[PDB]
């Protein structure tokens, strides 16, 4: 084998960021990252993104729907559309020898989409199926309510189309969103098996497409409201979030360390998390099945730090009080040094272990390229994560305690507290 290669970055005059790496794996992977997301919709159009990501297989001006599926299927490759409130990521996988074929489809689907109205109408009922499968897991419904409870305009937009809009999404709205949000400067392209120079000329085709900048959104404002649901399920879910720092900031690192100190993630299977502070606080509060951990969601505009607790309907109040009381003690300055080191080790192991997989590595590179366009190696992550001091964590805890809280809770709710009394 040859020497370990490095990733090449370049920025075309259009503003597009192109990044490539040359490994020697026999399977090649290509990804397109777009700054478009659910937060860029307004009240006039909603559920557009949720339908848009389902249209990846639809016909284009340069390729038919029949051709795309059959060609990809015969080669044995895949095409997926990951989505989130901030970003949308097209991804394709195949063998080394078939890259030139698949890229032709990928480029087409995002450059020359032809949203046939009859095709869109026939695809509409699929929205219900997708939405139902996601809501099968109650955690999805709790968060989408949580975002709608803590933000007023921008990030409150649901990832899934509202029920009343299912039958009323039009191709004109799809077209309008594409033109104003698929701008070149908003995009980034990543390749793993492909060579950099060929990536330049394959991407040269769409330099006559899009261009400039797109339609900017609105800074997400914080409200602090509650959204209860009162469903018939026996196991009540909840959420206790407060304003946090912004994605990619020094303060954001302190919050990451904070949640891992509170036993955010389980490590050993079929085992109690003794080191976790929250499980210890709850174990002496309830003697029936329970689950607890911390929450952390950082976005470009703002973040949200909080706590999630699955518990019995009767013991919901006690569980929440114990968790909240535990955070107060941390904020009071009672924090040992060993926990800081243990939490940091958990963070670094998680980071490296997550990036270990090629798919996640391509996802992490794309996310970083969009905001900055300059890859930051994991070693630099480690130096940043090791700079955290105890006083920083105490300040982070104090900010969470003093800040206004938003709570979304689905379940029986017979004994669950309210905000302003928690």
């Amino acid at each position: 084998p040859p020497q370990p290669q490095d990733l090449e970055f370049t920025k075309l005059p259009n503003g597009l960021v192109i990044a490539s790496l040359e490994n020697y794996s026999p399977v090649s992977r290509i990804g397109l990252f777009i700054k478009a997301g659910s937060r860029y919709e307004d009240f006039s159009n909603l559920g557009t993104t949720h339908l848009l990501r389902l249209t990846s297989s639809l016909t284009t001006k340069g390729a038919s729907s029949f051709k795309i599926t059959r060609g990809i299927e015969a080669v044995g490759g895949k095409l997926s559309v990951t989505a989130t409130r901030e970003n949308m990521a097209y991804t394709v996988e195949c063998l080394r020898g078939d890259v030139d074929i698949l890229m032709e489809f990928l480029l087409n689907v995002t450059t020359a989409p032809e949203f046939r109205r009859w095709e869109v109408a026939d695809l509409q009922p699929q929205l219900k199926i997708d939405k139902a499968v996601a809501f099968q897991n109650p955690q999805t419904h709790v968060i989408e309510n949580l975002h709608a409870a803590a933000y007023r305009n921008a990030l409150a937009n649901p990832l899934y189309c509202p029920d009343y809009r299912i039958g009323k999404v039009t191709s004109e709205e799809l077209h309008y969103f594409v033109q104003n949000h698929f701008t070149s400067a908003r995009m980034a392209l990543i390749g793993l098996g492909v060579s950099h120079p060929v990536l330049k000329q394959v991407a040269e085709q769409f330099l006559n497409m899009r261009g400039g900048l797109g339609l900017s959104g609105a800074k997400a404002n914080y409200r602090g409201g509650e959204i209860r649901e009162q469903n018939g399920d026996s196991l009540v879910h909840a959420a206790f979030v407060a304003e946090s720092a912004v994605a990619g900031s020094a303060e954001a690192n302190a919050f990451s360390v904070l949640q891992h100190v509170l036993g955010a993630g389980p490590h050993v299977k079929r085992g109690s998390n003794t080191t976790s502070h929250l499980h210890q606080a709850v174990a002496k509060a309830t003697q029936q099945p329970f689950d607890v951990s911390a929450f952390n969601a950082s976005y470009s505009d703002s973040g949200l730090f909080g706590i999630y607790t699955i518990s019995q309907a009767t013991a919901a109040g006690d569980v929440i009080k114990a968790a909240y009381n535990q955070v107060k003690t941390i904020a009071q300055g009672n924090l040992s040094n060993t926990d800081v080191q243990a939490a940091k080790n958990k963070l670094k192991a998680g980071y490296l272990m997550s990036v270990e997989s090629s798919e996640c590595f391509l996802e992490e590179v794309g996310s970083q390229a969009l905001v900055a366009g300059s890859y930051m190696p994991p070693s630099t992550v480690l130096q940043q994560i090791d700079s955290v001091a105890n006083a920083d964590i105490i300040n982070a805890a104090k900010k969470f305690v003093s800040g206004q809280k938003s709570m979304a809770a689905s379940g029986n709710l017979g004994h669950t507290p309210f905000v302003d009394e928690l």
């Binding site: 949720h50 990501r53 389902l54 990846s56 297989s57 599926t69 299927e73 895949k78 095409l79 997926s80 559309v81 990951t82 989505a83 989130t84 199926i129 997708d130 139902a132 499968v133 996601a134 099968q136 897991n137 955690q139 999805t140 968060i143 990832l159 899934y160 196991l235 990619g248 990451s256 955010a264 993630g265 389980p266 998390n273 029936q288 099945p289 329970f290 689950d291 607890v292 951990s293 929450f295 952390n296 969601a297 950082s298 949200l304 999630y308 607790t309 699955i310 998680g350 980071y351 997550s354 990036v355 996640c360 996802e363 992490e364 794309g366 996310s367 970083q368 905001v371 900055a372 992550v381």
Partner: protein, 48 residues
């Protein structure tokens, strides 16, 4: 670190022509099987 796929924040709905759609995130779950009895009943929607 700027990707939420490696965090416990929002979910990441996915779709694929051949693969199935499954959300992610790392907020508490799974570890409730040991202490509890949360059943997994099949319902109107079925996917592997």
């Amino acid at each position: 670190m700027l990707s939420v796929a490696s965090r416990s924040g929002p979910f990441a709905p996915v779709l694929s022509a051949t693969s199935r759609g499954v959300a992610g995130a790392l907020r508490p779950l799974v570890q409730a099987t040991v202490p509890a009895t949360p059943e997994q009943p099949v319902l109107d929607l079925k996917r592997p």
